[PDB]
Short mmCIF file of C-alpha atoms and ligand atoms in Angstrom, two decimals:
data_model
loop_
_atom_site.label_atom_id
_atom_site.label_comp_id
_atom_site.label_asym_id
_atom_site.label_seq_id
_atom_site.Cartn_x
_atom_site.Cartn_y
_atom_site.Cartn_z
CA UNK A 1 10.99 0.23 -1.18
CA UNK A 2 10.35 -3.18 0.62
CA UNK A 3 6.81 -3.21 -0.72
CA UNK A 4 5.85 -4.07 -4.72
CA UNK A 5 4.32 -1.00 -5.93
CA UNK A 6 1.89 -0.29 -9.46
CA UNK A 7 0.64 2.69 -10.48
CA UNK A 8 -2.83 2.48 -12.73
CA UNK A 9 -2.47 5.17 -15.63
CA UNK A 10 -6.18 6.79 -15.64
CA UNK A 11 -7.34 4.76 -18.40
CA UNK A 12 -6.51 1.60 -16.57
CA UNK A 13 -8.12 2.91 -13.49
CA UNK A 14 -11.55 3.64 -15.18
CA UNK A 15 -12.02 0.73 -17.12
CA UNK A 16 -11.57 -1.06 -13.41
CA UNK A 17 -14.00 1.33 -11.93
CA UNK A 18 -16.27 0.69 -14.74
CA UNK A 19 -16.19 -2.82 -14.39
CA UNK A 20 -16.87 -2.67 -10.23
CA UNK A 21 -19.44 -0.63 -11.17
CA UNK A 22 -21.26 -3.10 -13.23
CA UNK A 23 -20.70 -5.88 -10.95
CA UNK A 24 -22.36 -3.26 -8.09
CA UNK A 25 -25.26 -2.51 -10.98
CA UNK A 26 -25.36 -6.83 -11.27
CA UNK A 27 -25.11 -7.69 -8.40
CA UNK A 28 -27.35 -7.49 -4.67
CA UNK A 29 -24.15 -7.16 -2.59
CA UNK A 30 -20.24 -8.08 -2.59
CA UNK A 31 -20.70 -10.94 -0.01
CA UNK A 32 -23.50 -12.49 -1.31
CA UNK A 33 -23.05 -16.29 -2.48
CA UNK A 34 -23.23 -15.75 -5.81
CA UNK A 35 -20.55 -12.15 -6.15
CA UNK A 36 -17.88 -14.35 -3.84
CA UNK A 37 -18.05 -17.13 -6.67
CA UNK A 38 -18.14 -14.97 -9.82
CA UNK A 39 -15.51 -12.26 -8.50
CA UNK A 40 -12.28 -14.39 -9.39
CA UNK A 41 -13.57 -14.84 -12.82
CA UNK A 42 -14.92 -11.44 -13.43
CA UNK A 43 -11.53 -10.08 -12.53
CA UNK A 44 -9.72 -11.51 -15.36
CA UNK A 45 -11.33 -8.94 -17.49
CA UNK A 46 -9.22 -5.83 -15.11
CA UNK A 47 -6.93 -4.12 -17.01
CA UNK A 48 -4.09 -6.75 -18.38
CA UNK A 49 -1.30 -4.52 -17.15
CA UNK A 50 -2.28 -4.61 -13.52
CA UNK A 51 -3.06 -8.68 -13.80
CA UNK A 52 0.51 -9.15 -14.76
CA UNK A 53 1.65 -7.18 -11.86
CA UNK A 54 -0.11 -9.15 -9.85
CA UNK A 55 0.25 -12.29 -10.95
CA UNK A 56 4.11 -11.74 -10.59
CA UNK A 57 4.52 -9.33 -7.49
CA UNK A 58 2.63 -12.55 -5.78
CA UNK A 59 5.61 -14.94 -6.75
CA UNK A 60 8.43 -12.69 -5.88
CA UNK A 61 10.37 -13.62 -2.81
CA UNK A 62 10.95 -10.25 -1.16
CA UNK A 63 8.42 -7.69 -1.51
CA UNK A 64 5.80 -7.16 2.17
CA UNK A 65 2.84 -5.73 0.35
CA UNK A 66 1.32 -5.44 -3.13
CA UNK A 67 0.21 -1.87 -3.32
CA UNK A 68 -1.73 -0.55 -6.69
CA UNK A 69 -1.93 3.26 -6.82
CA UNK A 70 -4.34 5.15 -8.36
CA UNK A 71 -8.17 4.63 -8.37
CA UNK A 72 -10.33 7.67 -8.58
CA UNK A 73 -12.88 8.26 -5.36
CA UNK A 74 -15.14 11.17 -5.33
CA UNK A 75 -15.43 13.02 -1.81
CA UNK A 76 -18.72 14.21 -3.19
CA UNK A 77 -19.93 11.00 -4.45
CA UNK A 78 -18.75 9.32 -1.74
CA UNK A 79 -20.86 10.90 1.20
CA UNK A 80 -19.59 11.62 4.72
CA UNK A 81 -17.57 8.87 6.76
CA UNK A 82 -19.85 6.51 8.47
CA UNK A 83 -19.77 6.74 12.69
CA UNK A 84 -20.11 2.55 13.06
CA UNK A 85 -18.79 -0.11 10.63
CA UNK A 86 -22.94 -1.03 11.47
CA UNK A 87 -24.08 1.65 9.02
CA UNK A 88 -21.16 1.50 6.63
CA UNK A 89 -22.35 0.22 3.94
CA UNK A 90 -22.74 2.99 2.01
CA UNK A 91 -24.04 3.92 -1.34
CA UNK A 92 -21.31 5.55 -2.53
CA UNK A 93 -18.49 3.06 -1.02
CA UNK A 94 -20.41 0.08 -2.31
CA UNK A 95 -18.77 0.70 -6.07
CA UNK A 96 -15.50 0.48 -4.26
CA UNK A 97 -16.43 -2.56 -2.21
CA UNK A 98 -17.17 -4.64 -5.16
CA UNK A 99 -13.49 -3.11 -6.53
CA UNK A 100 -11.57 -4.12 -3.49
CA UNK A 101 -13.26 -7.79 -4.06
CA UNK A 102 -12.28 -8.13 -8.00
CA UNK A 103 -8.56 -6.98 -6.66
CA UNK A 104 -8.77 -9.43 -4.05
CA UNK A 105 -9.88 -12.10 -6.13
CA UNK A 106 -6.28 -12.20 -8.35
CA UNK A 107 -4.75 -13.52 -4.94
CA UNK A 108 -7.20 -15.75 -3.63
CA UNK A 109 -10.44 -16.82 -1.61
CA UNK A 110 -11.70 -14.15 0.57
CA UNK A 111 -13.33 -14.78 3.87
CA UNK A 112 -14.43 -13.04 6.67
CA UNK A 113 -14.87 -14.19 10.67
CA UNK A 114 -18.40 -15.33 12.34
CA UNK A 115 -16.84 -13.15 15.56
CA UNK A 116 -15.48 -9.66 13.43
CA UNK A 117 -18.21 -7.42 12.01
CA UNK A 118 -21.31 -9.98 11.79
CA UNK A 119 -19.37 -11.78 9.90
CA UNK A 120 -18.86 -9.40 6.88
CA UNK A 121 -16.37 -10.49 4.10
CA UNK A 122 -15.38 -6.62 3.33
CA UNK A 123 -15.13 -5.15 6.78
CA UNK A 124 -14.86 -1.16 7.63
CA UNK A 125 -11.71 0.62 9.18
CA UNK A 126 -12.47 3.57 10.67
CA UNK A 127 -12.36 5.88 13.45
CA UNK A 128 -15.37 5.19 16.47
CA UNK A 129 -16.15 8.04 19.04
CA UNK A 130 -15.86 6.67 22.17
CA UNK A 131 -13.19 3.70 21.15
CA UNK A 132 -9.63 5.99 20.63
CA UNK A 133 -7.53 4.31 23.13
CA UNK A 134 -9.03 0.44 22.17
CA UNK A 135 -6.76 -2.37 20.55
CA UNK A 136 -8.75 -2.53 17.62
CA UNK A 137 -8.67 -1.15 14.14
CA UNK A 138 -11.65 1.63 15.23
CA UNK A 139 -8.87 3.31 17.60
CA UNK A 140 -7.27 6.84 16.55
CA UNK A 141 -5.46 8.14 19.69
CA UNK A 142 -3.50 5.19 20.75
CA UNK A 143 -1.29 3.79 18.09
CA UNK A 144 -2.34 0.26 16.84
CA UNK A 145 0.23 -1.69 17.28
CA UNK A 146 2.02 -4.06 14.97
CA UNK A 147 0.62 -7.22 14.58
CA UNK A 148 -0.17 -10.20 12.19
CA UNK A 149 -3.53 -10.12 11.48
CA UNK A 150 -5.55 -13.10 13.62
CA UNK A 151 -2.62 -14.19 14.88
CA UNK A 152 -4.24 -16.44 17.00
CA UNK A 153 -5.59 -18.62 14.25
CA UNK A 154 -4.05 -21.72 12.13
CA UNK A 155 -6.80 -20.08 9.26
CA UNK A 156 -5.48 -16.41 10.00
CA UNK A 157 -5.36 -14.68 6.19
CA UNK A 158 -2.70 -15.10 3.40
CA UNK A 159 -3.19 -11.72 2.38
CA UNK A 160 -5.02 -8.30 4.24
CA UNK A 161 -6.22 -6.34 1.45
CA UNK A 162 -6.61 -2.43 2.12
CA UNK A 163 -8.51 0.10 0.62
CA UNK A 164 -8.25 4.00 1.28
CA UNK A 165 -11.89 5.67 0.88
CA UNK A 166 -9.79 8.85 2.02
CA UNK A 167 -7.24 9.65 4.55
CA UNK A 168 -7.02 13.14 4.35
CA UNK A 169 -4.32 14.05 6.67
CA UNK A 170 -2.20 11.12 5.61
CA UNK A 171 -2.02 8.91 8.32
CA UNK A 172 -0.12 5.93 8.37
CA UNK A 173 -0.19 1.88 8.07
CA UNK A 174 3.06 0.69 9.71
CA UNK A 175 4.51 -2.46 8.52
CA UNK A 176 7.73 -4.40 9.66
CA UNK A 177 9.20 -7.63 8.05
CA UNK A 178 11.45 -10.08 10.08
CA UNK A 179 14.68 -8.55 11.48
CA UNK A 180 16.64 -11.01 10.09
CA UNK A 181 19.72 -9.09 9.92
CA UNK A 182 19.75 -8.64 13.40
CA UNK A 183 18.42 -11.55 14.89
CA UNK A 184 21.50 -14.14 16.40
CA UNK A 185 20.89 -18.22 15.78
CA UNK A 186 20.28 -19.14 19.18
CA UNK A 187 17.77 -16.54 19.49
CA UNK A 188 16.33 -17.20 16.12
CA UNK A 189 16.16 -21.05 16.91
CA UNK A 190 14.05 -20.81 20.48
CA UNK A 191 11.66 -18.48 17.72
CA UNK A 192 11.23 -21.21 15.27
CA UNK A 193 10.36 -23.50 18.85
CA UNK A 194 6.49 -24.02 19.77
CA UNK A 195 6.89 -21.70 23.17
CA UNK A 196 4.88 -18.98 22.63
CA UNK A 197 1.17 -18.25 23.28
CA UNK A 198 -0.76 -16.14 21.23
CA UNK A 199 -4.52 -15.21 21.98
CA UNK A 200 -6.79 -13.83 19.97
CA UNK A 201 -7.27 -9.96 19.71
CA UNK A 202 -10.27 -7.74 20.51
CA UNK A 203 -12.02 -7.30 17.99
CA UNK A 204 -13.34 -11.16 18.04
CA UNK A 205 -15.32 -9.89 20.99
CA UNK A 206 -19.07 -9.79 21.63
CA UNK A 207 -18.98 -6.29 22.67
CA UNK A 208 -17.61 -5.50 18.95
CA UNK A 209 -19.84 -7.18 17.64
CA UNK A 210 -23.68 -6.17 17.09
CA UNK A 211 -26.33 -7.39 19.41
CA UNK A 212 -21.46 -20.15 18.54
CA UNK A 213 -18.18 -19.49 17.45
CA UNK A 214 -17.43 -16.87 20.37
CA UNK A 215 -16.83 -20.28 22.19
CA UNK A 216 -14.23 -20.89 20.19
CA UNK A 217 -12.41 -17.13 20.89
CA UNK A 218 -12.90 -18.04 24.37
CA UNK A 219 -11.43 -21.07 24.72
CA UNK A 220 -7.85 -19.77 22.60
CA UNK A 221 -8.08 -16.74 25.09
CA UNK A 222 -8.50 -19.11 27.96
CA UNK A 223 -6.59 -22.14 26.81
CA UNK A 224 -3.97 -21.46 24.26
CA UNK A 225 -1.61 -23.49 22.89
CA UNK A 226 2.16 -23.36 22.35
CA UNK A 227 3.29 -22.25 18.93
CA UNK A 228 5.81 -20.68 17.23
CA UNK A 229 6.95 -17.54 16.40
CA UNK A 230 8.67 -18.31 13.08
CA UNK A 231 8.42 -20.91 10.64
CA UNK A 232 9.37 -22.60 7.28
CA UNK A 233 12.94 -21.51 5.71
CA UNK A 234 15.51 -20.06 8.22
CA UNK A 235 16.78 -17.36 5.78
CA UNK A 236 13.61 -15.89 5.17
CA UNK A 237 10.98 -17.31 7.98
CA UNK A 238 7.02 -16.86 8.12
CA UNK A 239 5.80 -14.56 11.12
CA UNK A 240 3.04 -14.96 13.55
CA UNK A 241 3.63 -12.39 15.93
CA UNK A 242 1.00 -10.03 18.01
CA UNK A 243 2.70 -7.10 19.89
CA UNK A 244 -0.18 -6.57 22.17
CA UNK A 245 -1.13 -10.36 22.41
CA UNK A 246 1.91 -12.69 22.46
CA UNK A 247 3.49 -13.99 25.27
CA UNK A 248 6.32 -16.65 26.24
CA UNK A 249 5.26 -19.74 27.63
CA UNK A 250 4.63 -19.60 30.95
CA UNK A 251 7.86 -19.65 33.12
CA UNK A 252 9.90 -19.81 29.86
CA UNK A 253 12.56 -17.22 30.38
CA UNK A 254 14.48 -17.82 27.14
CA UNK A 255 11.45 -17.78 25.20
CA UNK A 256 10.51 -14.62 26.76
CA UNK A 257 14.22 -13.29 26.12
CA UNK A 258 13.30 -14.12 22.60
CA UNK A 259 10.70 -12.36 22.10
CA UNK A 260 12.02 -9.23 24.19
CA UNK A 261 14.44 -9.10 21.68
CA UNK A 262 11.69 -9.46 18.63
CA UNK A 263 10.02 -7.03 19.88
CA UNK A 264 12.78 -4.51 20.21
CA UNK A 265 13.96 -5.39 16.84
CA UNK A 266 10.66 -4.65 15.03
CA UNK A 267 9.76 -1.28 17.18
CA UNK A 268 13.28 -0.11 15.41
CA UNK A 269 12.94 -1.12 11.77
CA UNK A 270 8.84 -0.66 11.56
CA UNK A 271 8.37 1.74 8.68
CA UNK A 272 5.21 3.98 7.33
CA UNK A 273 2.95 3.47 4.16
CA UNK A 274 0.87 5.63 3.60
CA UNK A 275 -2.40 4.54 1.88
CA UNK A 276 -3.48 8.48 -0.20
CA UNK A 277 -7.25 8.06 -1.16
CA UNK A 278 -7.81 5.44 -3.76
CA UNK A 279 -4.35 3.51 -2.91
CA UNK A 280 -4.60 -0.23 -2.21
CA UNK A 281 -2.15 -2.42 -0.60
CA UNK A 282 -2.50 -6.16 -0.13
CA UNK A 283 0.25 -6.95 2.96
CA UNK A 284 1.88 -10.27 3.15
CA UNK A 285 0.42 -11.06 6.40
CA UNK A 286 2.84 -14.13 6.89
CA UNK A 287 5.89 -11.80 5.88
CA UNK A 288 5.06 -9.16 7.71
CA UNK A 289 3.30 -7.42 10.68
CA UNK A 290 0.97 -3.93 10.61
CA UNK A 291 -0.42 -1.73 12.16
CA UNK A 292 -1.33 2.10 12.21
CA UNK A 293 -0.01 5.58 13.89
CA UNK A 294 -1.44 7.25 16.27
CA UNK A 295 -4.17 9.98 14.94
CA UNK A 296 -6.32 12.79 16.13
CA UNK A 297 -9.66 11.53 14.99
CA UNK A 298 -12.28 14.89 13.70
CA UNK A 299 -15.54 13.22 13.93
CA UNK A 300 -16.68 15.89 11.00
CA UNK A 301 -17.74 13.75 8.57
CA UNK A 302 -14.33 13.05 7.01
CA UNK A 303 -12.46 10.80 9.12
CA UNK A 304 -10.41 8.33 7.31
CA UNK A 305 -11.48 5.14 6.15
CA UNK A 306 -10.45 1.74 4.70
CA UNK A 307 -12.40 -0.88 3.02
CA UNK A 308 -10.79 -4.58 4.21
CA UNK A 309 -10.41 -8.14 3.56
CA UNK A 310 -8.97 -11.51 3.96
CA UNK A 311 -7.66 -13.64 1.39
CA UNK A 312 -6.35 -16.87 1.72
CA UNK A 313 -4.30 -19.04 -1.03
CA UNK A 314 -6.59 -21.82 -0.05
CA UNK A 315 -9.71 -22.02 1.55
CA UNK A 316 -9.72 -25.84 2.28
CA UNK A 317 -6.57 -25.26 4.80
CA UNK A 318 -9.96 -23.85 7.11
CA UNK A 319 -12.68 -26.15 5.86
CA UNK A 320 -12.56 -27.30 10.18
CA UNK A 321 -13.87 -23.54 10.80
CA UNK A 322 -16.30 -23.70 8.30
CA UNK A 323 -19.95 -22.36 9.59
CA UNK A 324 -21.85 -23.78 6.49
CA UNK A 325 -21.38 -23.14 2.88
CA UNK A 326 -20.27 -19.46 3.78
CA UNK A 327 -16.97 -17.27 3.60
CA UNK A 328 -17.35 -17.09 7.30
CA UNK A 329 -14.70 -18.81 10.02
CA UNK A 330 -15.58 -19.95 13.51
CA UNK A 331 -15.39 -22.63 15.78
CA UNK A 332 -16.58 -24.40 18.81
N1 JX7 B 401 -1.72 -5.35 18.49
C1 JX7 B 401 -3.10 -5.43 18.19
N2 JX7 B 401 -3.87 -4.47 18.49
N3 JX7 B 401 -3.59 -6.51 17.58
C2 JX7 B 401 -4.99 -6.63 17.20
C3 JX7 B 401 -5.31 -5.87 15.93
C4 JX7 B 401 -6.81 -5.89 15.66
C5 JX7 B 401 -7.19 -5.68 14.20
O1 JX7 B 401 -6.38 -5.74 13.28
C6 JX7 B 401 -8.60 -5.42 13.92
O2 JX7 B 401 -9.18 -4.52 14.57
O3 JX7 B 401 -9.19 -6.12 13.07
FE1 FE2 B 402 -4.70 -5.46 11.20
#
């Protein structure tokens, strides 16, 4: 598989549901101040098994996700998939939450955005009545389409943690790595040029957001920059690619050609993971793009839904987008 994959035997997987379960009995909530500091060092006492993995799946050169199989969730204990991301902080996720977060904290500093979810550090996927056909995680009917996450951003994550609170019918994350077996020099040279314009996506919007730094969205909607496409080492470049929001420089037609041919390339080799309840993946986000198929959403109470985050190998490399002393990104 092109994804680094772990399977917790049940012993493993309760004494790490035990131990997010003290941290939810210690603690007020995951993204207070004082759970974002301690969560890197309570994690060290996780199974030693699944710190090894990653510790090393992290270094190796290849794999586009980290994905760790195998943590209990009880339907029943669990309660009924929340309508809004507003009201989904749940009881019986919040155990989960605070598991996600000592998982995350093996990789690196989590964050979350001033403009995505009031600013939440763990953020809620899941389907939104009304929203099916939007560009933005809360869609079911339309396909999201494959993307690096924040694209947009020089402070975009490291790492996009995922975890499955249930997904009943199976639906699933797609995920495509650079074609780099098909992609010619030339075309793979005018990539690695800055001719490219990527805005930011959706969900940074006021109207996703409940009732500063939207100045900032605004102006790299309005005003964007030229970047690049690819970076770093030739035979195995970085990605920062948005299907939905990228676009050549204007009037450059060999840019464009470029990323015509990108595109093409990754609609043919994207390829389905499918996160089963308790499964949770951690994509590369700079060696790969996402996104997620196409669903019927039931609006019964059991719609599926993901627990997220960001993680970043270094939160100084955003200290510019810092609010205050928070987790939270944003800018003027
Ligand atoms: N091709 C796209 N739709 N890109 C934007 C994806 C939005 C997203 O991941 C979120 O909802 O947080
Ligand atoms: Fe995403």
């Amino acid at each position: 598989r092109p994804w680094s994959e772990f399977r917790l035997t049940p012993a493993e997987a309760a004494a790490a549901a035990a131990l997010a379960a003290r941290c939810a009995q210690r603690y007020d909530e995951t993204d207070g101040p004082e759970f974002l500091l301690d969560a890197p060092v309570i994690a060290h006492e996780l199974p030693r098994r699944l710190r090894t993995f990653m510790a090393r799946a992290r270094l190796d050169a290849w794999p586009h996700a980290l994905v760790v199989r195998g943590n209990p969730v009880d339907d029943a204990a669990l309660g009924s998939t929340p309508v809004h991301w507003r009201t989904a902080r749940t009881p019986g996720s919040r155990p989960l939450s605070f598991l996600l977060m000592l998982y995350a904290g093996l990789l690196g500093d989590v964050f979350g955005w001033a403009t995505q979810q009031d600013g939440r550090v763990v953020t809620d996927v899941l389907p939104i009545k009304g929203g099916e056909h939007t560009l933005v995680s809360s869609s079911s009917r339309q396909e999201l389409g494959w993307h690096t996450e924040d694209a947009f951003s020089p402070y975009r994550a490291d790492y996009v943690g995922l975890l499955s609170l249930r997904n009943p019918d199976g639906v699933a994350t797609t995920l495509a790595g650079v074609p780099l077996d098909d992609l010619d020099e030339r075309t793979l040279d005018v990539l690695f040029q800055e001719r490219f314009l990527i805005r930011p996506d959706d969900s940074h919007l006021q109207v996703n957001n409940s009732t500063v730094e939207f100045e900032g969205i605004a102006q790299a909607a309005d005003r964007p920059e030229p970047v690049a496409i690819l970076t770093g080492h030739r035979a195995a470049p970085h990605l920062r690619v948005d299907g939905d929001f990228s676009a050549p420089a204007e009037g450059d037609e060999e840019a464009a050609a470029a990323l015509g041919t990108l595109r093409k390339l990754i609609d043919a080799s994207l390829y389905e993971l499918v996160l089963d309840q308790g499964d949770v993946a951690f994509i590369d986000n700079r060696r790969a793009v996402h996104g997620r198929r196409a669903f019927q959403p039931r609006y019964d109470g059991r719609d599926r839904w993901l627990k997220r985050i960001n993680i970043t190998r270094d939160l100084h490399r955003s200290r510019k987008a810092w609010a205050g002393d928070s987790r939270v990104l944003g800018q003027r």
